[PDB]
Curated annotation (Swiss-Prot):
GO terms for cellular component: cytoplasm; cytosol; cytosolic ribosome. Zn(2+) 4 binds at residues 151, 214, 247, 278. This is Methionine aminopeptidase 1. The lineage of its organism: Eukaryota, Metazoa, Chordata, Craniata, Vertebrata. The gene is METAP1. Its EC number is 3.4.11.18. Cotranslationally removes the N-terminal methionine from nascent proteins. The N-terminal methionine is often cleaved when the second residue in the primary sequence is small and uncharged (Met-Ala-, Cys, Gly, Pro, Ser, Thr, or Val). Required for normal progression through the cell cycle. GO terms for molecular function: aminopeptidase activity; initiator methionyl aminopeptidase activity; metalloaminopeptidase activity; metalloexopeptidase activity; zinc ion binding. Binds 2 divalent metal cations per subunit. Has a high-affinity and a low affinity metal-binding site. The true nature of the physiological cofactor is under debate. The enzyme is active with zinc, cobalt, manganese or divalent iron ions. Has high activity with zinc; zinc cofactor is transferred into the active site region by the ZNG1 zinc chaperone. Its cofactor is Zn(2+); Co(2+); Mn(2+); Fe(2+). Keywords: Acetylation, Aminopeptidase, Cytoplasm, Hydrolase, Metal-binding, Protease, Zinc, Zinc-finger. A protein binds at residues 123, 221. The chain holds residues 81 to 384 of 386 of the full protein.
Length: 304
């Protein structure tokens, strides 16, 4: 395998971290290939759940806890810390909140969160590499509590980064907030990609195509599929009570992606950097509630 960039995996990994049995587990947790029967049963559906009041409550809760966990990870980012060390802390932080780390054994993913450095677009596996000055690192958290998943990510700066890293991460965050700001009943899920690409392109960046935002609630990934690029053919119209993510991945170079032989780690084919931000959103009568919002600050961690 020819690596697209300078990054390499740093194995071996620490043995699988156990989750105490008193933590409620999603269905895939103990499937041998980490497949989710509830997802399998609904695969290919276009129908979007309308959440009940109790659902909304469970989504608010798990998304607030997920935010707390991301905030733990953010506080650890600095040169020298390994992504594996972040994942350990995250795993403990989930358990400490009576939650299961959704990524863990999701389709056999080996860790409890995704850590994506520089040219990793998404789904990077926490490993023994210490973060280096000038890196950008995204940590993507999902927790599972009482039958509900809550999903968010942020890109972070490791020490001083260069002007291109600043611009990439700022622009990515802007893309996200501009898409969120359009969300309300009656808007077509496909329009979000128009808004994202218009902003990325204005700033000299491309938009990943192979990964999309998604519905989330009792299932980790379900309807709707939400592409982040212009003129896509997503199906569906936003309605009050819909819950989904928007998670644009934006790149310095070209948009094309490939996967490492680990089956997960998605990288730019050109080996240039990519950044991402993600929130879980609930469509309300008037607009949208950002379930995974930071509560103790108006801003993401990279600004502050
Ligand atoms: C280990 C998996 C975790 C992953 C989804 C996997 C398909 C992310 N939270 P995503 O939905 O890409 O934001
Ligand atoms: Co995520
Ligand atoms: Co997601």
């Amino acid at each position: 395998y020819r690596y697209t960039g300078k990054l390499r995996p740093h194995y071996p990994l620490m043995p699988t971290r156990p989750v105490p049995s008193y933590i409620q587990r999603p269905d895939y947790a103990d499937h041998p290939l980490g497949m989710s029967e509830s997802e399998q049963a609904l695969k290919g559906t276009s129908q979007i759940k309308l959440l009940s009041s109790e659902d909304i409550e469970g989504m608010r809760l798990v998304c607030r806890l997920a935010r707390e966990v991301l905030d733990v990870a953010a506080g650890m980012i600095k040169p020298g810390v390994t992504t594996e060390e972040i994942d350990h802390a995250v795993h403990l932080a989930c358990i400490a909140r009576n939650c299961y780390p959704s990524p863990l054994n999701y389709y056999n993913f080996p860790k409890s969160c995704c850590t994506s450095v520089n040219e990793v677009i998404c789904h990077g596996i926490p490993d023994r590499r210490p973060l280096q000055e000038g890196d950008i690192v995204n940590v993507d958290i999902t927790l599972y509590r009482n039958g509900y998943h809550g999903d968010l990510n942020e890109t972070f700066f490791v020490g001083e980064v260069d002007d291109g890293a600043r611009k990439l991460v700022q622009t990515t965050y802007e893309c996200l907030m501009q898409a969120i700001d359009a969300v309300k009943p009656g808007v077509r899920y496909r329009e979000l990609g128009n808004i994202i690409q218009k902003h990325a392109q204005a700033n000299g960046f491309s938009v990943v195509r192979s990964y999309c935002g998604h519905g989330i609630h009792k299932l980790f990934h379900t309807a709707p599929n939400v592409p982040h690029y212009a003129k896509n053919k997503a199906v569906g119209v936003m309605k009050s009570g819909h819950v989904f993510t928007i998670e644009p991945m934006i790149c310095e170079g070209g948009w094309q992606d490939e996967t490492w032989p680990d089956g997960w780690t998605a990288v730019t084919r050109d080996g240039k950097r990519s950044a991402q931000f993600e929130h879980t959103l609930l469509v309300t009568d008037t607009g949208c509630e950002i379930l995974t919002r930071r509560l103790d600050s108006a801003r993401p961690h990279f600004m502050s």
